[PDB]
DNA sequence: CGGCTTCGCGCA
DNA sequence: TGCGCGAAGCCGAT
């Protein structure tokens with residue numbers, strides 16, 4: 001519907017109805033940014049065709065209490081910045097509190113909205129909210145993929161077994177869907193209290209040391225749309241060249257460090273891709289980084305979109321389910337409870353340091369996250385309980401948590417999703433093994449351990 | 454049947 | 466350090 005720099009395959013109809021006479025509403029959830037946002041861009045273009053203004057609505061659920069302050073403050077601080085950015089474009093933004101199923105339905109009826117638009121998330125709860133909203137409105141309802149370069153439903157119509165089968169499908173579609181963004185045209189027809197409330201409720205559950213001092217260090221990542229672009233620029237200028245060689249060395253700060261911003265949608269992944277492609281850097285680094293942000297990120301969306309049990313044992317490939325089941329009665333060399341993992345009270349100082357990097361920074365290094373989750377399986381009572389422990393700690397403490405990438409990455413580590421079978425072992429069966437000595441031969445483990453006590 | 458993210462391991 | 470191989474199962478291939 002309408003457009004010049006607008007591929008209509010990025011948009012799909014969720015509900016048919018008679019377009020009302022009122023404003024077009026972008027229900028923003030996953031992509032909390034004003035620039036490089038196809039969902040906001042398509043809402044703007046729709047509003048222009050109907051000769052009405054575009055508005056933005058955001059509903060804050062009670063689901064923040066299940067995580068921590070660190071995610072709550074990162075999102076809210078960024079949202080305070082976004083509120084101003086939209087204001088400059090004469091686009092009003094309304095922030096609701098409660099269940100989106102009821103509030104968004106009510107918001108469209110009370111403000112006489114003409115069209116409703118939302119962005120795309122493959123997670124179960126978003127689909128739940130959408131179905132409730134559909135049953136509570138009569139205006140058309142659209143969905144736009146503003147998070148993936150190639151729309152999730154276009155890249156593939158099925159669960160992809162591996163990156164080597166998904167890669168050619170995804171990259172074949174890049175010349176069509178990888179394109180520059182148009183400017184957001186302003187409207188022509190023209191929070192801080194929520195933040196103090198949520199913190200007061202989340203203070204009793206704060207991660208604290210033995211000195212009653214909080215563990216989280218908030219200065220490693222400034223939230224917001226402007227900071228995200230700043231992190232992207234310094235990556236291309238200072239880190240991209242060495243990425244290909246040092247990306248898996250957790251003693252070196254060579255990752256992009258973009259994942260917190262990407263998760264809350266404060267920066268567009270397509271934007272990162274556009275700028276990295278144009279950079280003249282190590283071709284091996286660019287290929288490695290573009291592979292991660294394109295293939296692996298968007299195959300995580302694919303995984304959750306086509307496996308609604310994406311966070312459960314049932315979603316593992318049959319060979320992994322058969323192997324792990326056979327080893328359910330094997331004696332584990334160690335058994336730790338969730339609380340003992342959470343506090344870093346295992347026998348393994350490398351594991352403990354990884355959990356400490358997570359507790360202190362809210363961003364565990366990408367390489368050690370594999371080691372971290374595989375030892376949770378190795379030292380747990382059962383595969384299901386390891387999945388519970390890993391998902392729990394990931395979503396509680398990772399700034400980028402509660403994300404398709406986390407479920408796919410944990411399912412890769414514990415259940416062999418998007419991996420293959422390896423040598424038979426006790427307890428972990430044919431799931432890929434990673435060892436302390438394997439890490440010693442790859443990077444300075446003692447240095448990593450010492451930085452994080 | 455070729456060859457698989459991120460493996461360990463032997464060996465330059 | 467980097468490379469090649471081993472141990473495994475299966476997908477798209479033919």
Ligand SMILES: Cc1cc2nc3c(=O)[nH]c(=O)nc-3n(C[C@H](O)[C@H](O)[C@H](O)COP(=O)(O)OP(=O)(O)OC[C@H]3O[C@@H](n4cnc5c(N)ncnc54)[C@H](O)[C@@H]3O)c2cc1C
Nearest residue numbers: 255256257258259292293296297366373400401405406409
């Ligand atoms: C056990 C486990 C849990 C994970 N949990 C999360 C999570 O909660 N949130 C999250 O965003 N990522 C998660 N990942 C993926 C990966 O570890 C992080 O995306 C990465 O560490 C973020 O740092 P970065 O942006 O510097 O990564 P970079 O090396 O700079 O990569 C750039 C971007 O590529 C994407 N990417 C990189 N590696 C992967 C991967 N394996 N799968 C999917 N996308 C990837 C991410 O969007 C990332 O931000 C998890 C991986 C594992 C093994």
